[model samples]
Target: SELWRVRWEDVEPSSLERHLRSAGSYYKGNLVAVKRVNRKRIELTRKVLFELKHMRDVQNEHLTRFVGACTDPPNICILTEYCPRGSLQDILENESITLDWMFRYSLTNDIVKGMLFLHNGAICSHGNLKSSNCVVDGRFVLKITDYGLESFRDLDPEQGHTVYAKKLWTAPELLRMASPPVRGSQAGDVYSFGIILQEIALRSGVFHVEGLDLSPKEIIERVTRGEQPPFRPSLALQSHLEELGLLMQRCWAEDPQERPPFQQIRLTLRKFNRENSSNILDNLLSRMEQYANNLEELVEERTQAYLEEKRKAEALLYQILPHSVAEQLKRGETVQAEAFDSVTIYFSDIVGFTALSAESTPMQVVTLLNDLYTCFDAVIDNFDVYKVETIGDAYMVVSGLPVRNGRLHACEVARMALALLDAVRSFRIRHRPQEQLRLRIGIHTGPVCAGVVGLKMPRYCLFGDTVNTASRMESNGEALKIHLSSETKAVLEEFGGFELELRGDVEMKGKGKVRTYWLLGER
Candidate 1:
């Protein structure tokens, strides 16, 4: 029997503390719950030694295994098998851990089995059987703890809000008595079990009667008064568990003799679990598999939604900049400003856009431009040119910069220009359907620098005299014609399957004398 005593020096303290009474520790390489007692010195009487030996020998599946007790002075604590998952009250309060009806039934069954063992053993009853006294192991099996050794657990002076709350599980008869037995009667233990059953069924705190706002002290007083109906925790709303609810009512009956023992309670719970197979592990495995399937489907749906949004964002970015430049930016790479030896720039505007706007309403002008540009945009897609930007009635396009096509830039721009003019002819101005929409297009070929401009709302902008000269050519050109600069004309002549007519030396604003030509139909 001396072997049942655990050495105080061998017990290592851990940071894990559950409630006020119990602290986590490790004894002989195994985790243990050390129940702290208020006593400094315990008298090692024959009765005390016998009880300690009895608890040490007691072992059952549903009971918290008695490891050993430290009888050393200043370190007097009862060591038992530690349940890592905390108490039953803790599990019920946690919203994340879903406890289905089967889980609740298993837990209640475990409590009944543990209580039955205690009542049949030398330790007659668990005087303090509450939700907090019941713990769950890592395997999710509920185990009864903090039972027996009543004399060692001398009452500490009641303090704080929980003092009266702790008494909520006490039987009505015990509450009425001046001094109840330290090791409570089997009938009183049955009452506590009934209160715990209510906790398991409702998944609420102890004595949580619905629609009754009485305080813990007030509720205790009412139960002790023993009213005609007998004040007890309510099960009024739990119609689904009609059979179990009726069983709970009988457990906490007005007369202690009326309550059924744990043996009968176990049989009733077993009957309830008969249809679904009482194996908790099998039930958990099936539930886990169902969750896994649902998780897979949810992950796939989220991935598809993410990819769809990414594609939409890329499409919008491509519309704002050239494809190659947009790709570089998307990859988080720096786009260095580069100089192109020769790139053809095209600038075009509606011939009488200012006067046309004056004649038509703002909405009509927007409608006319949208209709005309939509046709122009569709036709240019056939060519290898990037539409730089469209400003008011002016449109700017460039070729051979982001992705170079050499001397083919001039041909690409010229062909696209003619195609745009053709498209505009068919484009109908909704307000002025009778009048033709005249477009003056200019083409210039020269060296230029291009790069993305700003951090916010960035633009792919072209710089140098070539851009300015292209604009001037458009300004001086006549309606329904493609104006060509001498540089562009020279490039086109080198490529040669095109017809062009010289306009002869013309007086230009920026240049004193410049030779310009009108691009006729291609040969």
Candidate 2:
């Protein structure tokens, strides 16, 4: 019934239906991931989990929301908001995502905002700040996760200062200390952020010595020993703006105390974004229309192709909006939102889609959603699920009376939700390989009605509290997270084979203080 205590019964590996990102699993209807530690470390893990208890209360858009931790043997892991985009490291490794000035600046801003919140608030420093720890949500917004477990830091050999790979991101001063723990410091985070900035600009995985593809161990030794000029990521003048290049240098300065705090860094990135950032998508796609004129030369053949394409598109639309609704619109019949008893509604919205849309071309955005929804469409086709409609980046669907499944409605929707989440996870944007799409999903089981609305275009839509509550569940949900109303959770619970996380009672705007649980995964 609380947020911090993820009941042991609910956290099971078998419940891992699938993986949505590189690190997370969909368990018991929730898009949750696990970090395994040895059974012997249970005692220590408990201590760290207790320390992170306060983290449950620390909610911020820039930081990943800590759901809870499971200390059950072999199941020991920390649960937090799942970001679909693997990590900044993943993005950097992917060469295809366009990193225009605006996109880069936005990412930089996101990093600084996360750090600034950490530094200014209850937590002092994000001990493990690295590109790999920075995750992108469905909206392509970067958020900081997997931090504040200093007690658990040593358990992972690859995480602490003992790991040479980690030393690359560690402050040189820390590296110099004869015995320094992997504890975090404001200065250390700034230094690591600097390295991340370089990675953003260069798309390098880690600190790569220009000449030799040397071992990470050797590179760390050189940096720590200050071998001659020392080892660091190069900021070639032509590669970055002079200001950004200078900022990187100052952040990674040998003297940690001299590094700028995140507040200043945030302001500078924001300013840069304002000055140079425009509608990259608009600018990039506007000229694409000109290519259509070339089709006129082959009008006969092109028109035929166009008709086929249009017919395919219309068929797809019919599949999306429901047969009866399509028929009504075609017949020019007046449709009204009708009421029905006992139905389950599913709602999902892309996280940070507006900002992401602005960064890419309209054509690319269209293609991106079309591809994603196409995959989702295929997934839903396997189940008795109905695709209600999609508005911009938000998708609404249902299972049950439009064609009722009785109690089976909840189970069908849960299965479809998991499938859809996984589909988006592996989905690739052809023009933006670095981009990761994420969705906030909410499901509710209740009384509902379905009908057509909007005189202009006439949309087949669900009506009633069930629909609105499902919408709230999504809006109140986290990116790459699926929230379920108590009603829907109860139904799924009754059906069995589903794991749910208690989200605690939240004051819903229209409904007020509603108890919610996350659909973790299916058994």
Candidate 3:
């Protein structure tokens, strides 16, 4: 035998079977569908050999490729390509599977192409064509199977309700015959295609008639009896499906000769699609590409929004602490107290603030303090200094600790004090415009320790005697005068361009006596 006979021993059974009388098997490492014949007797007929030889030669993209058959005694089975996605009938029955018009057109086109190939080949026709015999592979490509083995299939006769149900796809002429041709007629196949088209369009079972509750047997009898206007599948098609409805009507015409051929059906379906690429795989790839592009754009948009929020948070952090210290804390590092050998600390407060606040309203006092600080805050921005804190009427500022600037700390503090004194000259209280606001300013230069203190509401605190000495200088001085310790004066004299008057030695509260100077103006 020149036929490719498969060895029965090489066939291994699997649990992936999805069709009746079908078994999934691995033949020589390739998955193949094994259809078992129930007949016990074996007959090596010439017609059977001819059909098998013809199947071996037939090769097409839409038709399932026939693997070699296992014809050994007690294990008779026909093997073909195994499609993992099961049959078109199963796919149509699944409610979760969405079938759009383009997808339906692609399936219809596949069936037509396979049937056209069968008609043109030696097989002449697919003896039985239905949705169940059309299988979908992993890539969703539809292929027609169970063709050209009529003699082998004839040994096993279908019984009961199955016989009538299977005959639903049979043409009326074939159903009326005592014994129809084993290979079937081309016109009969076109009628079956029409029934399958109805199933695809409605996503229902074959020969589903509307308003007429008829069994498969009753429906088959009506079709075979040739009733007037011949009983056919109902098509309540939408407006967009009008062309398809017309094509199906012509496919199942009452007169077999009037029905169009598979070639013409294929051409009509191609025109209906109106696209160069009708392959389902291509359509799926295009859809996936579109989803990926949208996902990428969404990721980019979210990242930009995250970065903007981060910038705003960092700006707020910088306002609370020095830039370097805040950056270290943000990185989860501990901030340690550092001592500066020589740094300037400035302290100032409103003169006679207790008596003035007693007479003024709380709102008026708040307005006065806010207006005065607004001017001082703007003036200090020109110099490198950090505003430490404001306790009621007291305002404190310092320079050269978090970031050291050598002896420039005294110069920065002196320049800022001069500027702040000048700002208070024009500063006016909004509520009490006629009242003069007197600000007592003091400056001290010495070693001091600075660090962030407290967890709940952290404050960058300056510790040691330098802070206390600066406060003492502000209290001992007269209103509208800048008091300076001798340490601060010594640093200013080194920078030149500063005029200071001798304040002479005086008694301080904490200390017995301390020398001080009055800063008149910068020359």
Candidate 4:
């Protein structure tokens, strides 16, 4: 059997015994989510299946687990780790239980980590993230489910990631109903996440994207001239929810550049979580300020809510890494040292950012880059890639341990490199004017130990021979070039259909002469 191939009999309706039993009723799996698509596009189906696997590999605590799938000819059976708790939609509707103040932070943390792994680590875009797509397990662990592949275009389709899940859940920039079919921006994802934050604040009920998306955009446009969401949390939620509102507002900014990244989101959540864990667990008893549940304790109540929400977010980040690691880094402690057998590494930079920025206005430079990378970052979130961090004009992302995937981490990195370059090109054309910007990206394979270092906001850093070498290739490439080391080259070759420029033996800083080649593009 081919790596991504599956047989018809194995995953047919008759053969789906497990899924039949799991969906709460029998007979057939109902293929509830896959409709309006072709039957024999098996190769395209396999490609979709590959994306599913791509997700499962760099699996993080917050993301929905990808179960085995049947890439059969006529019927494709994708069995994901079912969240019996159902969609966030049903839970808020049926459960009668409001999300504990802590889970509010937890859910936020969960999805961002899922998004962080997707954007920074895997370097793909979630294009879609929302409550209904967030799956709750028995442990109350929220896993980001249904990457919108099976029902992808059918469910949200052209809505892009932000507006796709549900229009109401989309950001203001996305709700723009102007001409050109209105490509929903990745900032829409940030907008969606912010709305989800509001949902977390009011887990007492659910919200929808019905006429609201257009109405708000219209109202905001007439008065504010934009698509800003209209919903506002009450005074009771002012304290903790304020930061959330700020985050959401920043995320939903008319300009997508103003959106906060997953790492920044992750860290902010971590900071909040560390400040409130003790209060959250005591049944939220001690979680309150020095008062015994007094009525009209509006200010005090809001304060506690904010405190608890912060704590819950930090806990989620901790779940994905070590407490000491999370803690030390949070306190602005430079990471001492942490070791792992393997970790995925990625590197990206603007093709002609320095030259372009030099010729442009400071605001334009900022706007151009903000426009460029914000969109690029969204594509990064599409896969389980992580934005390890950025260095000025350079954008660095990776995968494989902070959570490891047993399969080809390097190959995944190479694919992301391609995606990143493509995403930037698209962004540049729209924002960079007549003088278009390009990218020069380079990726390398192998293990490295990464950690936070230096005081006053310790930065997460990588070590080992692999990290240094990758940076060199990135620095020494031509315009719009995606370069790679021989190791990275071998991995890409395995995937098949790629062209190269074997500009070998170029010397690099610190490392003497290094052999490298440029990956032109996928064939």
Return the lDDT, model 3, position 124: 72
lDDT by residue (tens digit), candidate 1, 79-127: 7777765787876775545566665666677678788888999877878
Clashes per prediction?
Answer: 0, 17, 0, 40
Model 2 alpha-carbon miss at residue 62, Å: 1.6
The ten-residue window of minimal lDDT in model 3 covers 17-26
Please report the candidate that would top lDDT against the real structure.
1
Candidate ranking under lDDT, highest first, comes to 1, 3, 2, 4
Query: Can you tell me which runs of candidate 2 are displaced by over 4 Å?
Result: 1-3, 14-29, 39-50, 155-162, 237-240, 276-523
Q: By the lDDT metric, which is better: model 1 or model 4?
A: 1
Question: Which candidate's TM-score is highest?
Answer: 1
Residues 1-523 of candidate 2 have per-residue lDDT tens digits of: 2346565686455445443343211455557766654644445456566566657667777777656666566556766667775777775554533355555666676677778888887667777777778887766656776666545555444554457765467778778987665556778778888888887776455764477878887878888899566577776547447877767778778876687866887787667645765564553243223323423444566569889999888776544456666776567785556666688787878888788788887788788777876777677778887875667777777776555556787788888888877787888878868878777887888888777655545456766777666766677788887788888777777888888889898787785897878877888
Q: Model 4, 424-490: lDDT tens per residue?
A: 5545443445654666666777668876555544445678887776676677777676777877676
The models' CA-based lDDT, in order, is 0.77, 0.70, 0.76, 0.57
The superposed Cα distance between candidate 1 and the true structure at residue 66, in angstroms, equals 2.3
Give the true-structure RMSD of model 4: 34.1
Comparing 1 with 3 on lDDT, the higher-scoring candidate is 1
